[PDB]
Amino acid sequence: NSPVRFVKETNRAKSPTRQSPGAAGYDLYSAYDYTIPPGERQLIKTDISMSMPKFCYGRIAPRSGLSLKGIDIGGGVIDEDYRGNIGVILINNGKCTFNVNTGDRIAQLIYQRIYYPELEEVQSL
Amino acid sequence: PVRFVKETNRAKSPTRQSPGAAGYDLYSAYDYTIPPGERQLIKTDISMSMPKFCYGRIAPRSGLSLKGIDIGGGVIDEDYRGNIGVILINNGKCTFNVNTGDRIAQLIYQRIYYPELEEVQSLD
Amino acid sequence: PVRFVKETNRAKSPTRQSPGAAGYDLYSAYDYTIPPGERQLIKTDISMSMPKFCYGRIAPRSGLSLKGIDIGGGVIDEDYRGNIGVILINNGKCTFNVNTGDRIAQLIYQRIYYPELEEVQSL
Ligand SMILES: [Cl-]
């Protein structure tokens, strides 16, 4: 249980942070400026890449404030071996246009602990 | 032992019905009416002191999901000590009614990890 | 070790793609058609024994998510012993086709906790 290394791809990226010592996840921020109209989704870029911890995955989880405004998360499974610019799919299920500015908090990345079992085909259980 | 508090007598204590259930059932404490394409914050009138290296996920019941009732948000932080609400998204075509005492979700205590983040020049 | 059963020959063994993959790939055992703004329970014809202190999350493939396809429900409990279903929701603008054998989701074995609850008067 050592440090998770992350790379800022550009000067626009903000280091992920936990609000509080008991916060579930690390907050992710838009590196660019977007307009999402009602009934549309947009992949938002963080310009962050990280080497993910072992036996875990990163859940791109919703911030509750944005969810009460009708902003949900699409996809959001960051694999252990994924090394690219992390992106967040924001779904505007609200009634009017939602603006994403550079620096805006858009989601929380939770390091969810997972198992990698062997699968064995059987006749019955 | 996770301690919990009822804000009112209207709160139902979260239930666990079998050893192989993913978590605990959450129940509405109030009456609600959610029109099609609209979301509503359902108050459970339960607050709790959450265990270490976990978050509580407000997770969907399959039966409601199958009716087009999805879960908004739902990340209960370890140090969230307020009234637990369930954002129900009515993605069906009919008005969805929530009565006091109705099962609305399952709370799942999800084991997580809190790494230190160290910025580096490059990974690989 | 997890034991799984193919209910029909139309079922495909769940596989991980890479050693660092989060979930095991789930496939449609049948043909489906999903209208925009509608959902569909997809049958995998795979039933399995879930590990202890765990639940399977039916999680999205990010590629389908970019096309507007999302996952409904998806909590596979430890004592669920039936055909694993996948609720795909078509939140795109056009009809969605599912062909027998298509990759529809991934299953993530998510470690959980079964704590005791105790009512108190304050925290
Ligand atoms: Cl999850």
Side-chain angles (χ1 to χ4, degrees), chain A residues 57 59 112, chain B residues 55 57 110, chain C residues 55 57 110:
Chain A
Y57 85 97
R59 218 258 279 202
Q112 310 208 181
Chain B
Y55 78 103
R57 173 155 98 106
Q110 298 209 168
Chain C
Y55 89 95
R57 225 255 276 182
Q110 306 202 151

Side-chain angles (χ1 to χ4, degrees), chain B residues 23-71:
Chain B
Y24 290 83
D25 295 314
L26 293 172
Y27 303 85
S28 188
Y30 301 97
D31 294 330
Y32 292 95
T33 294
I34 334 163
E38 298 287 353
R39 58 190 66 206
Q40 185 63 69
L41 185 80
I42 313 288
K43 284 146 92 180
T44 62
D45 278 3
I46 297 282
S47 57
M48 65 207 337
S49 73
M50 306 284 303
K52 277 145 65 69
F53 315 106
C54 282
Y55 78 103
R57 173 155 98 106
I58 308 310
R61 268 289 159 185
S62 303
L64 290 187
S65 295
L66 279 156
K67 291 175 173 167
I69 308 304
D70 299 322
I71 298 286

Side-chain angles (χ1 to χ4, degrees), chain A residues 80-106:
Chain A
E80 177 176 346
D81 63 6
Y82 178 73
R83 292 291 222 262
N85 179 333
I86 301 188
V88 179
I89 310 165
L90 290 183
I91 314 157
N92 189 353
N93 289 326
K95 293 295 166 170
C96 197
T97 300
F98 183 74
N99 296 299
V100 186
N101 297 300
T102 309
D104 281 2
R105 176 177 72 176
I106 58 175

Side-chain angles (χ1 to χ4, degrees), chain A residues 26-110:
Chain A
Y26 299 64
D27 289 312
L28 300 177
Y29 302 92
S30 179
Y32 301 98
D33 308 300
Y34 303 87
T35 296
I36 321 166
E40 303 290 325
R41 66 188 57 202
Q42 168 79 53
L43 182 76
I44 313 292
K45 302 177 89 157
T46 62
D47 282 3
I48 297 288
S49 74
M50 24 188 293
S51 53
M52 299 283 310
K54 282 176 82 79
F55 302 99
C56 280
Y57 85 97
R59 218 258 279 202
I60 311 292
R63 268 291 161 196
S64 294
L66 295 184
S67 297
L68 289 160
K69 286 181 185 171
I71 307 300
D72 307 307
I73 309 287
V77 178
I78 305 303
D79 301 302
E80 177 176 346
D81 63 6
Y82 178 73
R83 292 291 222 262
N85 179 333
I86 301 188
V88 179
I89 310 165
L90 290 183
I91 314 157
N92 189 353
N93 289 326
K95 293 295 166 170
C96 197
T97 300
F98 183 74
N99 296 299
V100 186
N101 297 300
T102 309
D104 281 2
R105 176 177 72 176
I106 58 175
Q108 53 175 333
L109 166 81
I110 314 172

Side-chain angles (χ1 to χ4, degrees), chain C residues 94-115:
Chain C
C94 302
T95 281
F96 191 69
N97 289 292
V98 182
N99 290 285
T100 298
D102 282 356
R103 209 211 294 164
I104 60 173
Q106 56 181 318
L107 185 76
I108 311 173
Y109 294 93
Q110 306 202 151
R111 309 189 59 186
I112 60 177
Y113 184 36
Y114 303 134

Side-chain angles (χ1 to χ4, degrees), chain A residues 2-7 18 20 22-24 26 49 59 62 67 70 72 83 93 108 110-113, chain B residues 38-39 55 57 73 75 77-79 87 89 110-124:
Chain A
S2 48
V4 168
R5 297 175 147 183
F6 73 92
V7 172
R18 286 174 75 214
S20 58
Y26 299 64
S49 74
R59 218 258 279 202
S67 297
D72 307 307
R83 292 291 222 262
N93 289 326
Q108 53 175 333
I110 314 172
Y111 300 98
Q112 310 208 181
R113 296 172 70 180
Chain B
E38 298 287 353
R39 58 190 66 206
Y55 78 103
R57 173 155 98 106
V75 177
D77 298 292
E78 198 200 302
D79 55 2
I87 304 170
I89 309 160
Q110 298 209 168
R111 317 202 94 209
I112 58 176
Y113 167 54
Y114 297 138
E116 296 298 282
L117 295 190
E118 194 197 324
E119 199 196 324
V120 295
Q121 197 143 10
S122 71
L123 314 159
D124 32 35

Side-chain angles (χ1 to χ4, degrees), chain B residues 1-6 13-16 18-24 47-49 51 54-55 57 59-62 64-70 81 91-93 106 108-112, chain C residues 36-42 50 52-58 70-80 85-87 89 91 110-123:
Chain B
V2 178
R3 278 95 198 198
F4 81 89
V5 170
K6 292 172 168 180
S13 298
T15 57
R16 184 165 169 84
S18 68
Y24 290 83
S47 57
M48 65 207 337
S49 73
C54 282
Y55 78 103
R57 173 155 98 106
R61 268 289 159 185
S62 303
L64 290 187
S65 295
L66 279 156
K67 291 175 173 167
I69 308 304
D70 299 322
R81 313 284 267 246
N91 286 314
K93 310 300 168 184
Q106 46 185 331
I108 309 172
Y109 298 97
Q110 298 209 168
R111 317 202 94 209
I112 58 176
Chain C
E38 306 282 349
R39 56 194 60 205
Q40 176 60 56
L41 177 60
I42 312 298
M50 223 60 47
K52 294 174 59 56
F53 299 90
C54 153
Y55 89 95
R57 225 255 276 182
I58 312 277
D70 305 319
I71 298 298
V75 186
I76 310 304
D77 300 286
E78 210 184 291
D79 64 18
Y80 178 64
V86 174
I87 303 159
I89 315 151
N91 282 326
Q110 306 202 151
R111 309 189 59 186
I112 60 177
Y113 184 36
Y114 303 134
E116 229 168 345
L117 287 186
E118 190 200 328
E119 198 187 319
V120 286
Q121 281 172 325
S122 65
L123 312 158

